[PDB]
Amino acid sequence: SVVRDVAIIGLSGRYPQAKNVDEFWNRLKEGKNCISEIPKDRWDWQSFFDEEKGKKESMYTKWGGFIDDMDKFDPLFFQISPKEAEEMDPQERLFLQEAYASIEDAGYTPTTLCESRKVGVFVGVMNGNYPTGATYWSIANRLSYLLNFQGPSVAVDTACSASLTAIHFALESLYSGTSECAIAGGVNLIVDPVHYMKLSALTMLSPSNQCKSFGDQADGFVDGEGVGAIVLKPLDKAIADGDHIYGVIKGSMMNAGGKTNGYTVPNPQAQAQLVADALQRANVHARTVSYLEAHGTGTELGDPIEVAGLTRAFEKDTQDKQFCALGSAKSNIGHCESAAGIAGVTKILLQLKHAQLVPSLHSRTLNPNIDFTKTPFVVQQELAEWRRPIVEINGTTNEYPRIAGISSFGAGGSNAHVIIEEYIPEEQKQSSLKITPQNPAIFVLSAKNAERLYEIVQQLLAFIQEHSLSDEHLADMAYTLQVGRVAMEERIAVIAGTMKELQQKLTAYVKGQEHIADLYRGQVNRNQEMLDILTSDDELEETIARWMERGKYSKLLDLWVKGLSIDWNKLYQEEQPGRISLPTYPFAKESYWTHA
Amino acid sequence: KVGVFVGVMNGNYPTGATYWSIANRLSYLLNFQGPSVAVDTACSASLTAIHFALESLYSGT
């Protein structure tokens, strides 16, 4: 059907030295170069290292963007056996965990995300080096099975553009209505030295730890790892349901360069057509774009071609010069193949959340072959406020939203581009759910076992501290914890009328205090029998309804913590609080590996 | 604007799974500049590829 606006309602990711998107923000804002030495637990690089570029069965770098705890997993959470976990590619494991976390971040459970179960799964992947083989379809299908998704389920491989192709397909699927909700993302892990030997034989990699995006002396990219997932939802429905929205994808395109002077040589004309077509489909004039996250792999050939293409595409709409900032996240985390597009999307969404532009590293001296004074763009060098541009298109002047474009190009010539606009809410702050000591909030927490629940409490205290959450967040926090977390076997619940009170009681719990006022502990495992026989009848769900109205909070929580199912939505008779991001489940970190 | 959609699910050759190149080599050699993608949906993979092609034709890309 027709192009329409698509909301991003959920986000999770793991990047070098960034186990969550908060760390990613800290790395971006500070201009951190996240490249490190090949960990000994991957292989010993000295055995294979040779300065001779292009040599066979060798490599000329010691560097990569490696994530921590690559081999860890919580198989019991998913009722997967340890042997099966050993046999599962860790790429599948990590995408599964990030998608689950992204669902928690949105504030939904697997059941309520989509009642029809028509949730699509689209995943980009291009490397399959685990010893048990490439099994890309299973990265999607494992998710669809475990989470009861009955929409499309597909693994895509378009090389370096794979995750942006996947996003494009997801937008198509939402437009045609075969999915009402969708998971989109990509994954790439470096699990075997042959990964580096192949890239080294074609001399595509830099020897150094610097991806010099648009910088002088460009000599290839630094290889990287990444895993990310986003939840996509129609904008109108996202507004109606009160979800929190990182941004609105207005449109995208993917294409290929066709025949150029040599295989893997990029074609600037096709890139220009790509970007022009994305802008036309989005109905976005190029002059309103104020940041461009480039592919920016740091090769001497590709960067000038890219800038020529961008200049040609923008010059179709405007002759204005140096109005749009340009940068690349690869300067921080390196080039991560199938996850490069999702990493760039994440950076754009974080910039929108913080309304900030971060440094693009290693471009203090610009490519001497690129005359930026002849272009629409200024390469972003320092942390700066991201300004809404004021623009006189058509001799009419208006303020436009912060809008960014992102391009992603594959080695085989497959290109994609996506247009992302800030979401600007309507100013409705009735605040009729004001949480006070007279109208306290119900905070519920649960986990598979006591260790995980304890870690959940620690992470909540830390998150409240980190983001300076206070009384005005209690309503949204409690609502999100009520309706946006699966109620697991080990449960606690706290009544609090102020943030300080919550911090006090939770710290006392963390501190080992056996008896805490208005804090209840218990397990579902114990009272399974009586639960089964009483909840069948609505008669008792009505009794709960009356307890809630009357405010018998202590009673409901004493029963809830033993396993009594409570429809927390009935707690909000008039209106609804908003969903907010909160920390996600701290999966157990146990190592599993096979033998080749 | 010729699209290429190919279903594949096994990558056991000694130099590795390089599924993207099965499509991109074709698009390069024949000067095709439409979408070029390797899809893996296991057994149904080629019919998934057909489904994608039908969509792509429907939207006019």
d(CA A415, CA A406) in angstroms, rounded, equals 11
Neighbouring-strand partners of residue A186: A124, A228
Site from A126, A156, A280 to mutate, B interface, most B CB atoms within 10 angstroms: A156
End-to-end CA distance of chain B: 7
Q: Kindly report the three-state secondary structure assignment for every residue of A178-237.
A: CCCEEEEEEEECCCCCHHHHHHHHCCCECCCCCCCCCECCCCCECEECEEEEEEEEEHHH
d(CA A549, CA A186) in angstroms, rounded, equals 46
Tell which CATH classification among 2.40.50.700, 3.40.47.10, 3.30.420.10, 3.30.420.40 matches the domain A6-421: 3.40.47.10
Please tell me which of the candidates A155, A165, A414 has its beta carbon nearest to residue B40: A155
Alpha-carbon distance A62 to nearest alpha carbon in chain B (angstroms): 22
Query: Given CB atoms, is B49 within the 8 Å cutoff of chain A?
Result: no
The answer to whether B28 and A413 are in contact (CB under 8 A) is yes
Technique behind this structure? cryo-EM
The answer to whether A16 and A333 are in contact (CB under 8 A) is yes
Does residue B52 sit in helix, strand or coil? helix
Are B28 and A412 inside 8 Å of each other by CB? yes
The single-letter code of the amino acid at A386 is W
Torsion region of A366: left, alpha or beta (phi above 0 gives left; psi -120 to 50 gives alpha)? beta
Does residue A577 sit in helix, strand or coil? coil
CB pairs under 8 A between A and B: 113
Per-residue DSSP letter, A367: P
- Resolution to 1 decimal, in Å? 6.8
Pairing state of beta strands B4-7 and B36-40?
A: parallel
**CB-based contacts of A443, cutoff 8 Å, min separation 6:** A477, A478, A481, A493, A494, A495, A496, A502
The answer to whether A342 and A230 are in contact (CB under 8 A) is yes
> Which one, of A490, A520, A525, A491, lies nearest residue A505 by Cα?
A520
Contacts 24+ apart (CB under 8 A), A466-469: A466/A22, A469/A499
The answer to whether A59 and A197 are in contact (CB under 8 A) is yes
The answer to whether A272 and A304 are in contact (CB under 8 A) is no
The single-letter code of the amino acid at A493 is A
